[PDB]
Each structure stands twice: as C-alpha cells, then as structure tokens.
Amino acid sequence: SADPKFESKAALLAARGPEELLCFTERLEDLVCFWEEAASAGVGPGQYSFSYQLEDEPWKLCRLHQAPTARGAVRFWCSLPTADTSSFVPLELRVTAASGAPRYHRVIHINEVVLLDAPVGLVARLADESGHVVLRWLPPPETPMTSHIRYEVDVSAGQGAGSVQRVEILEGRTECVLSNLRGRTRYTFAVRARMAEPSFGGFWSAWSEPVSLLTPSDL
C-alpha cells in the first residue's frame, strides 16, 4: 500500500522545506498534501483534522494517512478526491490538532504546485568542431504538455564540491551546449524539469540520472 513514486517526490520536497505543509500535483487532476513531524507518543492520523474548501463548496474533511519516513519521523498525508481538485481556483487548506490548536493553514492553486518526474535520457558529448560539451535529454515521462517545460542543468566537478554551474534552459529546449569548461577535467551533469510560468507553476523535479565526461585538453 506504499506508493514508491509518491514517496520519492514526497521526500524530495520534504528535504527542501522542512516543517511545512507540502502540496503537489503530478497530472493536474490529483493533489496530495503532506507534512512530516517527529514520532510523538500515540499520536496518530486521528489526532489531526484536514479541512479543505474551494470555490463555493462547503468545507470538506480529508482522511489523513500516516507512515514512518526512511529517517524515522512520521508523514501524514491527504490525497484529495479527484472530483474536488479543480485547477485555477484558490484552494484553502487547514490542519487543526484534535484539541482545536492550529497546525497548518495554506492557500494554494493546484496549477501552481506541479511536480514533474525527472528528465530522462541524459547524454553528454564533445562537439567535433569545438571542445564544447553538448548535453541532450528527453522530457520527463508522461508529462501532458512538453512545450511548457523549462529545464535547468547542473554542472559539478568532483565530490562534495557540487553545483559548479547551473544553466537555465529556454522553454522546450531539450539541449544544452557548454563552452567554458576547463580542459582535462572530469565534469558531471544532471538536469531538472519544471512547469513554465505564468500558465502553470510548481517545483523543480528531482535531478535526472547524472552523466560524467572528461573534457579534452588544451582548454
């Protein structure tokens, strides 16, 4: 009953914004909200109440699930019914403790919390004419509209000293050519994907599988 694809994305966002209520959608028809907190006594999913309201519908309750995280905390989450997820309208979320105490309160737009899969098929090659490295990849799998995806490639060199360079990629460009890399140097490359403003919005995807390359000499 454990969803590996969701729990991958969930731990990704959790590490970015700890102690926050984190919501995202993969295909714009779903919506999952979750948070993580230290395991405390016998506090279960019945000790919090997840309220949500959108448009003119009444405030509705969403049943919360819980499961321990790979680190040992507990993760509560609510998967909103696909019937209620409607994009481009404000959606008010409230988490209140069973005592009535405040826990979380957020307003989101489902079309602004897209979290794509990572890009796939990364390849790096040296241009034949110049020593430039050409990166190419494929759009994230099963993304509705690839024209409105913008990428970001990471150039790192050696372990522990990452992010030597980050390169913003124009919308719908599945290619990147790097022309300032120092020669005879082993570089490594990965690339993220995210939905492009202002029609949509969201979070950077997890990094693609990386690709390493040894630049030529005389550079």
Binding site: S99, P102, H105
Partner: protein, 223 residues
C-alpha cells in the same frame, strides 16, 4: 449582508480589483468564515501587500483571532511575509498575541527560520522569553532547529539561555539532542549550564551520549 462572503473569497484569491469593488459597495471588512478568519487573515496568508493595506486602511481588526487563536501577524510571521509583518505591526498588531499552542509570532518566526522577521518582531517589542504550551521560549525552538543566526538574535535581545520547558529542558539540551554543536558553543558562550538536567535527570552531556554525539559530549565536558 451577502457581500461579506464575497470579500473573503476575493481577498484569498488576491483579486485586487474585486476587493476594491466589494469594499466600496459596503461589504464588511471584518466578515468571517466558518473559522472566524477575516479577510485580513487570508490577505496576510496570501502575501498580498496591496490588499492588506486596503483592508487595514478600511479598519479591519488587526488583532482578529480565528477559532485557533491565529492572528494575521501569526500567519505573516509563519509564511515569512516580512513586508506584511511590517504593515500589521504598523497598525498596532499585538506583537505578543498567542495562539492555542501558546506560540507568539516570535515562536513561529523562530521555528520556521525567518531571521529577518525574528529581528523585526524583536525590534517591535516582542517578548523574547515568551513561553508556549510546552513552556518553550523562541530560543528553545531556534536551538532545536539549528538556526544559529536566530539563536544569536534572540540571545542579544535578552533571551534566557537557561530557560526550561515543561520537561525542564534548556536550549542546551535541545541543541545537544539535534547535534547543533555550533549552537551548543554559542549557548555556552552566553552562560549555558552544562550541569543542568531535565525532569528525567539527564544533562546536555547525557543527551549527547544517548544520541551518540560523543563529539559534542567532549565539548560540554571540557567547559
């Protein structure tokens, strides 16, 4: 008085123009939803500085509290909206208002790590040693969460370095429980008590060895 519902939905939608239309049409600036949340709550939660200014300039209750004890200053301090925090305090927002968890805006800003807002709230006369339901001061939250900057900010504004919570745990305990050795040193430099144990009878040294952080334990053992 149907307009009050439309103002709450417009404010949280960030609709600048529709809010001004409902304002001028005589809508209640202090309308409430099923939570007793006013449009100023939703405006502050959204981050709409323009709408917060309009609602405040039209007499919205700055210290409106919903049924959770949350005020707009609580929401702006949590979400990190420094600009909105300034305007709420500008209009006399109670800096030391507490929610049903006993947490003041300085608690929330410190837990979340908003160093700029922790400073601004302090600069506006926030109680540094305020205690929540667990008896924890903002320094407790900052020391547990590893925010060294906020820890130093609280310390230089008169924070009790040896404040004990309901468990009798000082920030030195919480810093040792999460391996924030850098904060352990900063607390020690302000007079933290190494020989201070909780109700359970364990000091900062005892928690580090129970956590396995003997590196941090030898730090407390020297001085």
């Amino acid at each position: 008085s149907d307009l009050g519902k439309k103002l709450l939905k417009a404010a949280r939608a960030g609709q600048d123009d529709e809010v001004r239309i409902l304002m001028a049409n005589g809508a209640d600036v202090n309308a409430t939803d099923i939570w007793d949340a006013t449009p100023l709550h939703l405006a502050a939660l959204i981050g709409h500085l323009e709408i917060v200014e309009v609602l405040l300039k039209n007499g919205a209750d700055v210290n409106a509290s919903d049924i959770t004890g949350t005020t707009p200053l609580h929401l702006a301090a949590t979400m990190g909206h420094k600009d909105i925090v300034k305007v709420l305090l500008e209009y006399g927002a109670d800096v030391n208002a507490y929610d049903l968890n006993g947490a003041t805006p300085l608690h929330l800003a410190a837990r979340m790590g908003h160093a700029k807002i922790v400073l601004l709230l302090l600069e506006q006369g926030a109680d540094v040693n305020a205690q929540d339901a667990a008896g924890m001061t903002p320094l407790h939250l900052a020391a547990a969460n590893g925010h060294a900057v906020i820890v130093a900010l609280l310390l230089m504004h008169g924070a009790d370095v040896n404040a004990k919570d309901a468990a009798g745990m000082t920030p030195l305990h919480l810093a040792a429980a999460n391996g924030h050795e850098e904060i352990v040193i900063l607390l020690l430099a302000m007079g933290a008590d190494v020989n201070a144990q909780d109700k359970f009878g364990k000091t900062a040294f005892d928690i580090s060895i129970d956590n396995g952080n003997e590196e941090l334990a030898k730090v407390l053992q020297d001085h």
